[PDB]
Amino acid sequence: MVKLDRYIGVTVFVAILAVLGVILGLALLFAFIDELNDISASYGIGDALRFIFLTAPRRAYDMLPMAALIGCLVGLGTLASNSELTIMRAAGVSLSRIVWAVMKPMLVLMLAGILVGEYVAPWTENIAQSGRALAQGGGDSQSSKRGLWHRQGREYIHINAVQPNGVLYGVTRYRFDEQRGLESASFAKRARFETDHWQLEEVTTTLLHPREKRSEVVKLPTERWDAQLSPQLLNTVVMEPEALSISGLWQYIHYLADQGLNNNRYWLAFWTKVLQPLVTAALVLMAISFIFGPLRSVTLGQRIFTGVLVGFVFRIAQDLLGPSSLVFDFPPLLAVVIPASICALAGVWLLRRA
Amino acid sequence: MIVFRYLSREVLVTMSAVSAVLLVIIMSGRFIKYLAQAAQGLLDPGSLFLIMAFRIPGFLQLILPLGLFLGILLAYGRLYLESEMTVLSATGMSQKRLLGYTMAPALLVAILVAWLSLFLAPQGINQFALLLNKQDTLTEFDTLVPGRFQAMRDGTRVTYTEELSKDRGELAGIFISQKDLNSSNQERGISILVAEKGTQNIQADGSRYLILHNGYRYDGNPGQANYRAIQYDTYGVMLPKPEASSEVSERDAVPTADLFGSDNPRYQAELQWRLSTPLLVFVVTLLAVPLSRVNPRQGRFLKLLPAILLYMGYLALLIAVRGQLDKGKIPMAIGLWWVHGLFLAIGLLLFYWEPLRLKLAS
Amino acid sequence: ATLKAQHLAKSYKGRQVVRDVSMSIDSGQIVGLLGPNGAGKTTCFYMIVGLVQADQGVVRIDEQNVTHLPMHGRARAGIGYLPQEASIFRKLSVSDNIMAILETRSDLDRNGRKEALEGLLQEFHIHHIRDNLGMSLSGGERRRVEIARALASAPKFILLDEPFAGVDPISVGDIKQIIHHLKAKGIGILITDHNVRETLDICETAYIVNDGQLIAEGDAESILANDLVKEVYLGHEFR
Amino acid sequence: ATLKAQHLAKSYKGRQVVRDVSMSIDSGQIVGLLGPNGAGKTTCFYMIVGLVQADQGVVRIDEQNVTHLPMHGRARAGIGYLPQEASIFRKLSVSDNIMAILETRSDLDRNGRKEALEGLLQEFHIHHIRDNLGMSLSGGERRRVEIARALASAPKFILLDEPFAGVDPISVGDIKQIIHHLKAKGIGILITDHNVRETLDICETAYIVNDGQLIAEGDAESILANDLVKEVYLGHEFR
C-alpha cells in the first residue's frame, strides 16, 4: 500500500504547512501590533520589526500542535467530503490503517518540532531578547530590566545587562566587612570569560579605607575576577522557562535541586517541551476521530471553525492548569497529561462508535 | 409583520448563545493571566472571584456587538441555506426591507450596550479598583529566603537580611543605601549604615516604622579625599500598592456626569469613546446583512473568522485613535468619528454592490 | 400577458454556455424547458428566474423590460418562483406561512387578507393542517403549502424547478393535478426537469436547449420524433 | 456464492423503521431494491453494505456470518460498493486510481499487478485516457473508471447505489451495458434507485419494501400486476 499512503501523507502535510503559515503570520502581526505601543526614542520601528522576526521560530514551535490539529482536520475533510475515504474503507483498507497513514508523515513533523525547539528556538529567542533590551536601554548601573543580583559570604555582584556571547554589561562589585564595613564600590563595563576567572573590562573600582582615608578610584583596564558564576548560569536565570532548551532546562532543574530551592515551574516547562509529540498525537487522533464522525460531509468552513474553537478551548485549559499547579500542590505532570489524555479518550470513544 | 417577528426571534437567540460563549472564553482568558500573578503570590487567590464579577460588565460592552454580528451572520446564513429567503425575495422583499427588519433587534442591543457603557461599566470598574486597593495590599511584601534579599525598583531601597521569619522577627539587620553612584561620583547618593535592627513594625498596608538605633552613615563621596562618616538613623520604608496603577486607570471609573463638561483632553476622549459602542452596534449590523448571503457550498461557517478579524481591527483602530487623540495630537473635532465614517463607508459600498452592478449593466 | 426571453447569452470563464436562445410563455400555457445536463438548460432557466444576470438579450413581460431588475423587482412585476429544495417556513404554522406573504399585498385590507387566506386554505385542501408547524409536515403536503404560499402573492407566472425530482410515482399524480389547477387559474407555468417522461406528459409546448442553442421545439409528438433530439438527447430507443 | 440477509431489523429513534426484512442475492444475477422514500429501502441497503449496524440480522456470504464485521471486514470477504456521488480520486491519474487499489490485494505480485492493471484498462476501454487527472474527467468516463477501480479489488457482490440518478436518457444505455458486463463475469449486483422504469427493466428480481416490511417480490411482470404495490407505491396508472 504505497500510492494511498503517499496521497494521504502529501495531502495532510500540505494542509498542515498552510495552516501553520497562516497561524504564524497572524501571531506575528498581533505581536507587532502589541509592540507598536512601546515605540519611543531608541526603540525604533526597525528594531521592533527585527525583534518580531527573530522571535518567529519560538512562535512556530508553540503553534505547531494547533496547526497540526487544524491542518489534519482540513486535509482529511477534503478527502472525506469527496467520498474517497469511503472508497478506501470499502476496498478492504482498515480504519487503523488510515490512522497510521495519516500519522506516518506526522512523526516527521514531531521530530522537526523537537529539533527546532531544542536547537533553533533558544538561540533566536536569546538574540532577540538581548537585542530588544540593548535597544531599550541599560546604560546606568541599574537601568535595564535584564539584571540580576548575586552574593557570596562578603562579595556582592550586580549585573546590569547580560549578553548572549558570554559578555556582561554593567558589572558591579561590592565588599562588606564582617562588621558590615564597606570595602569596595567597584564598577565595570565589560568582561571576557577565560578559564574559570572573569576577565573584567573598564574596571572603575572604588575601595573604601576603614580608619580615616576616603576611597580612591582606580581605573584599571582589566582584571581577572574570582567568581563562581558561569555564563550559562547567568543566561539561564534571565530567560523565561518557556524559552529554554531541553538540556538547559534539565541542567538548571538539577542545579536548583542541589541548592535546596524547590523547582516547580522549570519542571512544568520541561514536561511541556518534552511531551509535545504525545500532545500532538492525541490532538490529531481526536481530529481523525472528528472527520470519521460528526464532521463527515460538512463544509470546509465548518471544519476550520470547529478546529479553531476546540484549539482555543484546549490551549486555554492548558495555560490555566499551569499556574493552578503552582498555586495548589499537585505534580506538574498532571497539568500536561490531563488535557491531552481526555482529548485522546474522546477521540478513541468516537472512533469506536464509528 | 409576521416575518419581522420571525426574523427578530431567530436573530436574538443566536446572538444570546454566541455572546454567552464569547463571555465564557474571555473570562477564562483573563483568569489565565490573573492566576499567574496569584502564583507569584502577589495577590490573594480568594479575591479572584469578585474581580471577575466586577469586570464582566466591562466585557459585555465589547462582546455584545460581536455577538450581534455573529448572530446575524449565522441566522441569515441558516435561512439562506434552506432556500427560506429565496422564497422571501421571490414574493417581494427589498434588501432595504431586510435591513429595516434587522435594525429593530439591533436597537435593543444598542440600548443595552449604551446603558452598560455609560452607567454600569464605570461603577463596576470603580468598585473593583476600590476593593483591590482596600484589602488586597496585605500581600505586597513577600519574603522568600535570606539568600534572596530586597532590591526595590525605586533605586533607593536595597538592603540585606538574615534568615527570615514567619513572625517577622528573625529577619533583622539592615544595609540600606540609595547607592546610585556608579563610579562613586556623589556623596548624598548613599545612606549606608550598619544595622542589626529593622523590626517589621507594620502599621499601615505595609508601611513600616523601622527606625534603627544602629547605623553609621558613610556620606563621604568615595573616590575622593573627603571622608564624611557620621551616625545614620534609618530610611523610612512605606509600602504602597502599585497593582491598581499597573492594570487600570482613573479614566475608566469617572462617572459620565463628570465628563459632559471638562477641558481635560483625556476626560473628553473618554466621553467620545463611551459613546462609540452604540454606534458600533449599528455599523456592524449594517455590515452584517450584505455579508450573510451565502451559497450551499460556502456554508454559514465561512466568513466568521474574517468577521472577527474585522471587528478586532475596528476596535484596535478606535483605541489607537483615542490614545493618539487624548494627547492633543489630533484636534478634538474629527475625534473618533472618522473611524466610524470609514467603516460605515466600507459597509455602504458592500450593501450597494449588487444594485450598483445592475445599474452599471444599464 | 406574455413572458418573452430574446437573444439570451452568457459566458462562464471563457466558454460560451448559451447563445441566442429565444423562448416565450403565454398566460395559461404549460411550457417545459428540457435538455442535456451539460447544456445551458439550467443557465437559461436561472437567467429567466433572476438568479443569474444575462450577458445579452432582454427578458420582458408584456412590454416591461425586467432584465436589469432584481429578484424582488421581478416578483413584483408578476414572475413567481419555487425552488427545488424544501423551502417552507419551518418554525411557522401553515396558516401563517401564507399570511406572511398575504400581509405584503397592497390591494388587500384587513378583511380581504382573511378572506384570501380562507380561500387559499380551502382551495388546496389543507384546512385540516391549518395549525401544524411547517417543519412537521409530510412530503406531500409541503408542496401544496409551498404552492399556496407562492400563489398568495398573486403571481402572473410560476417557474417551477424540478417538481418531479425525487418523487414517488404515486405523488407525481398530485403534482400534475396541482399544475393543472394552476393552469386553470390562468397562471402560466414554466417547468424544467431531469425526468423527461412525466414532463413531456404534462407540458403542452417544450423547448430543447443543447450546446447552448434551441435545437428543437414543439408539442410532445413533434419533439419525440425529431432526429436531432433523438440522436443527442433521447437516444434511438426512447419509446 | 449467496449473500442471504435474514431477519434484518433496526430502529433509529426508538421506532422500528425496518422490521423483519429478508433478501437473498445469488452470485450471477441482478437484483433490485425499491420502495417509497420514507420506507426502509435505503436503511436496508446500508445495513447490507455495512454503513449502518443492524440490531438484528444473520447477514452471511455462503455460510460466513459477517453481521458483526465492520465495513472493511465485510468487503474483505468481497462486497463492493459504489457511492451515488462522484468518488474518483481527484489528484491522481486514471492508471493510478486502479493501481492504488490493486496494491491492496495480497495475492498479486508486481508482474501480476501490472498484467491485471492492463487487463482492466483495456477491458473498460479507458486505455487512451490513462494519464488524465481524475478531477478532469467527464461524467461519461468517470463512471467507467470508478467501476474499473471497484472491480480492481475483485469483489463477489457489487452494491450499486443510484446509478441511473441524474443522467440523460442516452446515458442509461452505457450504464445498462456495463451492468450486463459485470453480470457476465459472475458478480451479483444490487441496484437500488429512485427511478423505477429502467430499474425494473435491467434487474430480474425486485424486493419492494414499505413501512419497513417486505411487501412483494418477483420478476418485473410479476410485480407490476401486484395490487399492494399498485396501491401504496406505484399508483393505479403506472405503465
Numbering used by the authors:
A (entry chain G): 1 to 354
B (entry chain F): 1 to 362
C (entry chain B), D (entry chain A): 2 to 240
Q: Which statements did the authors publish about this structure?
A:
The IM sub-complex comprises the ATP-binding cassette (ABC) transporter LptB2FGC, which extracts LPS from the IM and delivers it to the periplasmic components of the Lpt system. LptB2FGC is a type VI ABC transporter consisting of 5 subunits. The LptB cytoplasmic subunits form the nucleotide-binding domains (NBDs) that capture and hydrolyse ATP. LptF and LptG possess transmembrane helices that create a cavity and a translocation path for LPS, as well as a periplasmic β-jellyroll domain.
Three distinct conformations of LptB2FG, designated as LptB2FG-I, LptB2FG-II, and LptB2FG-III, were captured in our cryo-EM data and solved to resolutions of 3.34 Å, 3.26 Å, and 3.31 Å, respectively. The main difference between the three cryo-EM structures of LptB2FG is in the conformation of the β-jellyroll domain, which appears to perform a rigid body rotation motion with respect to the outer leaflet of the IM, transitioning from one conformational state to the other. The TMD and NBD domains of these three structures are essentially the same. In contrast to all the reported structures of LptB2FG determined by cryo-EM, our cryo-EM structures did not reveal any density consistent with the presence of LPS within the outward-facing cavity of the TMDs. This cavity has a volume of 5,473 Å3, approximately half the volume observed in the X-ray structure (10, 513 Å3), suggesting that the previously solved structure may represent an LPS-bound conformation. Intriguingly, our structures of LptB2FG exhibit an open V-shaped cleft at Interface 1, oriented toward the outer leaflet of the inner membrane, while Interface 2 remains entirely closed. This structural feature is expected to facilitate lipids entering the TMD domain of LptB2FGC via Interface 1. The distinctive structural attributes characterising our cryo-EM LptB2FG structures strongly suggest that we have captured the resting state, or substrate-free conformation, of this transporter. In the LptB2FG-I structure, we observed PE1, PE3, and PE4.
